[PDB]
Amino acid sequence: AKKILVTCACPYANGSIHLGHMLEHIQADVWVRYQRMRGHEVNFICADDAHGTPIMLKAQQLGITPEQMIGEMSQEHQTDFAGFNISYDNYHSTHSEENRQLSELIYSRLKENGFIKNRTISQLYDPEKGMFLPDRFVKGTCPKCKSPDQYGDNCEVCGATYSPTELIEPKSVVSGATPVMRDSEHFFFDLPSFSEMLQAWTRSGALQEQVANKMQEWFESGLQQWDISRDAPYFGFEIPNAPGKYFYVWLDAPIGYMGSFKNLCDKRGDSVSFDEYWKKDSTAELYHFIGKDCVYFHSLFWPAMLEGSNFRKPSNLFVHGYVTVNGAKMSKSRGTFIKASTWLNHFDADSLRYYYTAKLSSRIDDIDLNLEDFVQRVNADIVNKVVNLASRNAGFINKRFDGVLASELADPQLYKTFTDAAEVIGEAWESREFGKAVREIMALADLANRYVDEQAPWVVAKQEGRDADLQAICSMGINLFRVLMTYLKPVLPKLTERAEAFLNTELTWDGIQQPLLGHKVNPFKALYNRIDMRQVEALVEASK
Ligand SMILES: CSCC[C@H](N)CC(=O)O
Ligand SMILES: [Zn+2]
């Protein structure tokens, strides 16, 4: 009955999708697929984050327009996400007419409401290229240790940190010219004006405990005004009435959430839903799946912007931790910085979806992809527990009973144990306690395989006159498989499709209350094959 708008953070348009991205998009997709299974109206929304100085400069280096460049990466991103079956209702771009009009609207409202301040700043400027330089486009000699060729505000030899104005003999990364300090008028969003409102939200108990605790540190330090403007040359949206000024990516990037939803509504011919979801009186729910590095932005700056422009605010933020590989930050030299596209050359999407889901919880803890454990857990849980219930039983049904399952359950008590678990498993999906859900599902899978072991179909099959017993045992196992695959349907979309083809039925959450009786199933080849460490070694080598 609910109306739900769910987002993932907008991926940066000048980088390939990697396993870190995939943790976020898989987490959101599992939750979204479960919400759809319970009958709610869900809109799963994302976009590419396509503006800014680095993108402008990279396009110039490539000799193409920024529009061509961001279009190519957007296609690359959506191909990768589609390969992992991330079920977006719309994937748009921050570089769109919808986002331009919404950015201009929100800015004009913030300005009229008194939340935009004008302030002159001083910044390093490349007089040959003719542009202000972000910190990382200034290089020079460390003022402390005198090591040359250091970038930005820190030295990678001695570890010192400093303003780039302290670099000795500074050079523009763009042109090699010596930069100089230049003044420019910038426009600032008066975030401090919203501190009391934001502190109330922090205390409300909606946010994760770990996020609320961190926000208290930020309030203690003191909220600051945030620069929302950039000087030309720039790739982005020009500020009305302010020639030569552009909106900084901070402003237009989250508005891209709104622009993507407006684009979806407009493409559908739906003239009511945008206001239904974004007006202040909305009864729809708005959720953002984000990582730790995006929490300050989504928990303070973004709700303040929405409040100041008369829009509704997020219902909640769902924050996940970083991905590690073999216990450590991804390492290019070790081959553990793994692109999504590369992953799919070696493994399927379901394997990573399952492994992440088994490790995820409602907390912000980092998620470790241990590659040895990945092989063991996928083979143990998917091949040998869940799929085993189908593969060990289907052959007898197809070959000796014409594909027809028994007309009654052999063990109705055991079946009720499986269906009785739906409430706790569903609540685990709902609360984002994914690891809890998987633990209960695999505990049931162990029960199901213990049942089959106890009945010993490999013995019954050879014994004269026991055809009825064999059909009963094998049909019971297949009905337990039906239930487990329903509980796993949000996690494993492609295996589920193969399971539905075998079972000759769509898997619905409520359907488990009616077992398959006197029901024809189809043959299948192999629902899910084993993986091995040679494949992991090939993935690592291909990523170096
Ligand atoms: C509106 S969400 C914007 C997210 C930024 N692109 C940061 C990131 O993708 O890591
Ligand atoms: Zn140094």
UniProtKB/Swiss-Prot annotation:
Motif ('KMSKS' region): 329-333
Primary residence: cytoplasm
GO molecular function per UniProt: ATP binding; methionine-tRNA ligase activity; protein homodimerization activity; tRNA binding; zinc ion binding
Binding site for ATP: K332
Family: Belongs to the class-I aminoacyl-tRNA synthetase family. MetG type 1 subfamily.
Record's subunit section: Homodimer.
Protein name according to UniProt: Methionine--tRNA ligase
Species the sequence originates in: Escherichia coli (strain K12)
